[PDB]
Design a protein around this ligand. Sequence first.
Ligand SMILES: O[C@H]1[C@H](O)[C@@H](O)[C@H](O)[C@@H](O)[C@H]1O
Ligand SMILES: [Ca+2]
Ligand SMILES: [Ca+2]
Ligand SMILES: [Ca+2]
Ligand SMILES: [Ca+2]
Ligand SMILES: [Ca+2]
Ligand SMILES: [Ca+2]
Length: 181
Amino acid sequence: DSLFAGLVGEYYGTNSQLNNISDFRALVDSKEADATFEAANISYGRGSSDVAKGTHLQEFLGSDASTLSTDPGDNTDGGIYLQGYVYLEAGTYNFKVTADDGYEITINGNPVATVDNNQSVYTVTHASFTISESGYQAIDMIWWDQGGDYVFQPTLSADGGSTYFVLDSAILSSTGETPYT
Ligand SMILES: O[C@H]1[C@H](O)[C@@H](O)[C@H](O)[C@@H](O)[C@H]1O
Ligand SMILES: [Ca+2]
Ligand SMILES: [Ca+2]
Ligand SMILES: [Ca+2]
Ligand SMILES: [Ca+2]
Ligand SMILES: [Ca+2]
Ligand SMILES: [Ca+2]
């Protein structure tokens, strides 16, 4: 599998409505990804006029779009599924996520940030969680756009919410091996 400083990204589009996490996960299950990419700087958007139309996905992904495997065709609705590893020291953390529409982030298989509905842009400060052992932790994310505006910026705090960082190539690994890229 390729080793890079990022998460493995998949994009899926649909012409059905995405109302909630279940709907997007079912879309992921239903087919092969419409495009793959390397998610090395997970701060996407904001934009307008549907993520799944035209070149809006490219604009949304920005700095990560040069790794797209293809340019998807138009759809009404769409979203991303990211998976891989993140280096975190043992301790307490919490996410603070800005998004339109919803999303779910899991670490070591456990949900740590959830918005199970559509929404115009909103920032949630999520509850803390603990990491028991320093190292590369498993992480995955889903996010979608039902239409209209779109943005997705998870940030993470290690210091009780005083400072937050974007998850990017400093700490992400596609396989859990140390990237030297
Ligand atoms: O991007 C849109 C936009 O913000 C709409 O005004 C809101 O109602 C939707 O839920 C969201 O998807
Ligand atoms: Ca699939
Ligand atoms: Ca396109
Ligand atoms: Ca950008
Ligand atoms: Ca609203
Ligand atoms: Ca829709
Ligand atoms: Ca939207």
